[PDB]
From a paper:
The DEAD-box ATPase DDX39B (also known as UAP56) is a multifunctional regulator of nuclear mRNPs.
We used a similar photo-crosslinking approach to obtain a TREX-2.1/DDX39B complex for cryo-EM studies. A cryo-EM map of TREX-2.1/DDX39B, refined to an overall resolution of 3.28 Å, reveals that the RecA1 domain of DDX39B binds to the concave face of the V-shaped TREX-2.1 and that the RecA2 domain binds to the tip of the LENG8 leg with significant flexibility. We also obtained a set of particles that feature the best densities for the RecA1 domain of DDX39B, which yielded a cryo-EM map of the TREX-2.1/DDX39BNTM+RecA1 complex with an overall resolution of 2.97 Å. For example, the NTM-C of DDX39B in the TREX-2.1/DDX39BNTM+RecA1 complex is sandwiched between LENG8 and the RecA1 domain of DDX39B, while the NTM-C features a more extended conformation in the TREX-2M/DDX39B complex. Structural and sequence alignments between LENG8 and GANP suggest that LENG8 contains an equivalent trigger loop (residues 559–570): a conserved YxR motif at the N-terminus as well as enriched proline residues at the C-terminus. Structural overlay of TREX-2.1/DDX39B and TREX-2M/DDX39B shows that the trigger loop in LENG8 is positioned in proximity to the nucleotide binding site of DDX39B. The LENG8 trigger loop in the TREX-2.1/DDX39B complex does not show significant electron density, suggesting its dynamic nature. The TREX-2.1/DDX39B structure captures an open conformation of DDX39B after both ADP and RNA have been released (step 4).
Numbering used by the authors:
A (entry chain D): 10 to 15, 38 to 251
B (entry chain A): 571 to 800
C (entry chain B): 4 to 398
D (entry chain C): 16 to 66
The structure:
């Protein structure tokens, strides 16, 4: 004997109740049938509830929209005649879908009011909607939001949750990026920014995170 | 369609159980179970039938390895048990500890231990799960695979998920310790391989440069460099 | 003092922006709370000619809460305190570039936590809901306070509300550890790490944060980080607060034992932690039987603390110590794999054979505790002839 | 009721903080093998034939 010589479902046991969400929010979560949160939900909900910037790249159908829907509904202080949540996306279909999600997750919180604006409709109707019953959540395309902010029909000085859906599609263009820059400039500097999209290329990531203060970046 | 009466849902669950026994069609079984528990959760039904449905789906999701579906079922079963439901508390506490071993969640294991009663720990399934957890944390692959050989209930189905990684860790430890050669019969004995063919099938992709033309034993000194690759 | 005089004093404090005075006039640790005249049932009519909103509603709710605490019934006392927090946050968010309400926020949050605990006790007595239900609502209110404090970034350092961030983080940590939702501490830890004031906060808040984060790191099997944070927390503690130091030691002892440092019996007696004496002696001596007996005797205490898993790796250290004892007794480097079997059988370990001895020694060598190899042909373990058992600190 | 309690003062600057003089022992690991447990182990090994 010689001598020794030198994914779609989270894998964590933490349901929606473990996120310390509002009981009126947990009731809606159970009602819509969401048993267990997705991996992106488990990664982003605790960070997004605290009102901090989030950057998320996840495949469609992984509960990406519900993340920021729950995040903005949790930290919502609703006051009459004041908008505190703004959602911007490049397509009218996504805006309608996110408005429907907001409506679905707020059947136990009658105070919260959500309004939707998009192109193809008269801006006079949007101004009338804003003046008659100013909502707490506004979902819309960058062009319509920019027009409503320019013509002094929407008060952007109260925004505290400015979020983008499919940030890649908006920030790849030039007119859309200019409109987003203008709208972000009008909003207050003390707020929360979250950006969710399916495919975030490395070329758009710097110009995507340029709008956030030390965001939590997650890519799948 | 969303509102489904409990009797019809029971009939559907029984039919799905019979179909799974007859044919073992995993996609159909998972779709049926997901629809069943979706209909249960939209109505807010938390009862013995709900715990039975979740138990059945979790047991089905172990014959065909689906960690995501099993985690969903077990994390629902935890709250169902906490709501004072009979279920199989010891069995699925054992499965919970075993899944936490699979995902390496020491904090979750500690939380589970903090709420274990004497009558629960007396259960054979949870006793086996606790012994396996002790062997895994203590790095005792001999005890680990001795318990993996005869695993009560469907414990072995969970262990199979991390059996391969545990075998790789054990083989790294053995190669770092057994010199100048490591017999493949020792691998067969320790790693709980039900066949020399299966043992060699596990050993082949690593490429450990076995000694002798017949590859009777692993040459650990030559395979030391290969350790970092796998 | 009359209610009119008290409200005039509150109004003067608010007008002069006296944060300390306003906190004293709203905290429940002040003798004015014991004043029977101040405690009122419906001060809604009053406070409106004195305090501008939302301070009027906040202090009326405080008066109602004082009346409640006088007449027990902590459930509606906690409801009134929640009203106080909600009313005060709206006024705190209005203060632009002025952190003069930080003491008020501190007192309000502390009273909210205390009333949440008392209301949970009352609700457990009533049997309506499980323990820790009001902790979730208190955590929601503290999260609102934390986000209000954190969103203020453009203000100057001297007037930033970020100074009131570690206190809220610590309150949230306390709630999470009470309700075992330790997975929620990651965003707070990340926020404090990204903050530029983490080395400038108050010493008490920094110490509490370090203790809780080290405890969570130990809970996540990050032993070096846990050791560093808990060592900082133990080193910096007030002499008067001995209970806090004992709680530090409870979770610092397993990590220091794992790293190779053993607590002294003098320390254990000084901080009244005698449950670790037998464990420390067994680990030092390599006594598996004594370690098992101690872990069984203090099993309830260790399970309640949450350090049973971390203390059962002292069994890993005990294996190394016992094998070192065997090697020193035999004075031979080509040790037989049956001497370790004899030692393990003497330690009353059930179903121990040469196979399990080989497995244990292989794991020890893989982890670096033992410098050697196993022949498996002559059934002998050969050691390095130099540093066969390296120090635990180096490993 | 076992929970981290609040400190009396918000700051102490280390003047009144307790410093512990070598409460950690690191020299326990030594080649000295003489205690009662060691004697028991040696007796067991001698009984089983190992010196």
């Amino acid at each position: 004997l010689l001598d020794y010589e030198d994914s779609y479902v989270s894998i964590h046991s933490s349901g929606f109740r473990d996120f310390l969400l509002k009981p009126e929010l947990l009731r809606a979560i159970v009602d819509c049938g969401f048993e267990h949160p997705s991996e992106v939900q488990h990664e982003c909900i605790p960070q997004a509830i605290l009102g901090m910037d989030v950057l998320c790249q996840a495949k469609s159908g992984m509960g990406k929209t519900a993340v920021f829907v729950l995040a903005t509904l949790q930290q919502l202080x609703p006051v009459t005649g004041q908008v505190s949540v703004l959602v911007m996306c490049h397509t009218r279909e996504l805006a309608f879908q996110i408005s429907k999600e907001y409506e679905r997750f707020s059947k136990y919180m009658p105070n919260v009011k959500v309004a939707v604006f998009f192109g193809g409709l008269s801006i006079k109707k949007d101004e009338e909607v804003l003046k008659k019953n100013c909502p707490h959540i506004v979902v819309g395309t960058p062009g319509r939001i920019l027009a409503l902010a320019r013509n002094k029909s929407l008060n952007l000085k109260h925004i505290k949750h400015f979020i983008l859906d499919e940030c890649d599609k908006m920030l790849e263009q030039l007119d859309m990026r200019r409109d987003v820059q203008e709208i972000f400039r009008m909003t207050p500097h003390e707020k929360q920014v979250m950006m969710f999209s399916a495919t975030l290329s490395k070329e758009i990531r710097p110009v995507c995170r340029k709008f956030m203060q030390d965001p939590m970046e997650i890519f799948v | 369609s969303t509102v489904r009466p409990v009797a019809v849902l029971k009939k559907s669950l029984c039919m799905v159980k019979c179909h799974w026994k007859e044919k073992q069609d995993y996609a159909f079984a998972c779709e049926q179970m997901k629809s069943i528990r979706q209909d249960l959760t939209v109505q807010g039904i938390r009862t013995e039938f709900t715990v039975e449905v979740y138990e059945t789906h979790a047991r089905i999701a172990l014959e065909k390895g689906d960690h995501e579906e099993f985690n969903q079922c077990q994390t629902q079963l935890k709250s169902l048990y906490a709501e004072n439901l009979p279920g199989n508390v010891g069995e699925f506490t054992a499965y919970r500890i075993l899944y936490y071993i699979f995902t390496k969640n020491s904090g979750d294991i500690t939380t589970e231990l903090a709420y274990l009663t004497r009558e629960l720990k007396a259960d054979p399934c949870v006793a086996h799960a606790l012994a396996l957890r002790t062997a895994w944390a203590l790095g005792n692959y001999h005890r680990f695979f001795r318990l993996y050989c005869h695993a009560p209930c469907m414990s072995g189905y969970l262990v199979d998920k991390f059996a391969d990684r545990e075998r790789k860790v054990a083989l790294k430890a053995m190669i770092k310790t057994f010199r100048p050669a490591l017999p493949v019969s020792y691998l067969q004995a320790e790693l709980a391989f039900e066949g020399e063919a299966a043992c060699r099938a596990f050993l082949e992709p690593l490429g450990l440069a076995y000694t002798g033309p017949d590859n009777s034993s692993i040459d650990c000194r030559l395979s030391l460099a290969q350790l970092s690759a796998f | 003092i009359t209610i009119n005089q008290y409200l005039q004093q509150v109004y003067e404090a608010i007008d002069s922006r006296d944060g300390a005075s306003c906190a004293e006039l709203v905290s429940f640790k002040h003798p004015h709370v014991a004043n029977p005249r101040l405690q009122m049932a419906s001060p809604e009519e009053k406070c409106q000619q004195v305090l501008e909103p939302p301070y009027d509603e906040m202090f009326a709710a405080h008066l109602r809460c004082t009346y409640a605490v006088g007449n027990h019934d902590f459930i509606e006392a906690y409801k009134c305190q929640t009203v106080i927090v909600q009313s005060f946050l709206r006024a705190f968010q209005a203060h632009k570039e002025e952190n003069w309400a930080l003491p008020v926020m501190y007192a309000v949050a502390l009273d909210l936590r205390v009333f949440a605990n008392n209301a949970d006790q009352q609700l457990v007595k009533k049997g309506k809901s499980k323990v820790g239900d009001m902790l979730e609502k208190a955590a929601e209110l503290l999260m609102s306070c934390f986000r209000v404090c954190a969103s203020d970034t453009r203000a100057g350092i001297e007037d930033s509300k970020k100074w009131g961030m570690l206190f809220l983080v610590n309150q949230l940590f306390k709630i999470y550890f009470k309700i075992n939702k330790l997975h929620l501490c990651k965003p707070l830890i990340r926020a404090i790490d990204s903050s530029n004031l983490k080395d400038d906060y108050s010493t008490a808040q920094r110490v509490t944060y370090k203790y809780y984060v080290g405890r969570k790191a130990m809970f996540d099997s990050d032993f070096k980080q846990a050791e560093e944070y808990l060592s900082f927390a133990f080193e910096h503690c007030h002499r008067s607060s001995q209970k806090n130091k004992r709680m530090i030691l409870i979770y610092l002892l397993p990590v220091k034992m794992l790293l190779g440092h053993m607590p002294t019996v003098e320390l254990l007696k000084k901080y009244h932690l005698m449950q670790f004496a037998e464990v420390t002696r067994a680990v030092s001596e390599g006594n598996l039987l004594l370690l098992h007996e101690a872990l069984a005797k203090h099993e309830a205490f260790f399970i309640r603390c949450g350090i049973f898993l971390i203390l059962e790796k002292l069994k890993i250290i005990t294996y190394r110590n016992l094998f070192k004892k065997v090697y020193l007794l035999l004075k031979t480097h080509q040790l037989s794999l049956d001497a370790f079997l004899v030692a393990l059988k003497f330690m009353q370990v059930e179903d121990v054979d040469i196979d399990e001895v080989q497995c244990i020694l292989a794991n020890l060598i893989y982890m670096g505790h033992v410098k050697g190899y196993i022949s498996h042909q002559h059934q002998k373990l050969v050691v390095s002839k130099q540093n066969p058992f390296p120090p635990l600190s180096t490993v | 009721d076992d929970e981290f309690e609040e400190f009396p003062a918000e700051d102490w600057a280390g003047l009144d903080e307790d410093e512990d003089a070598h409460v950690w022992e690191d020299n326990w690991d030594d080649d000295n093998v003489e205690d009662d447990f060691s004697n028991q182990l040696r007796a067991e090994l001698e009984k089983h034939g190992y010196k």
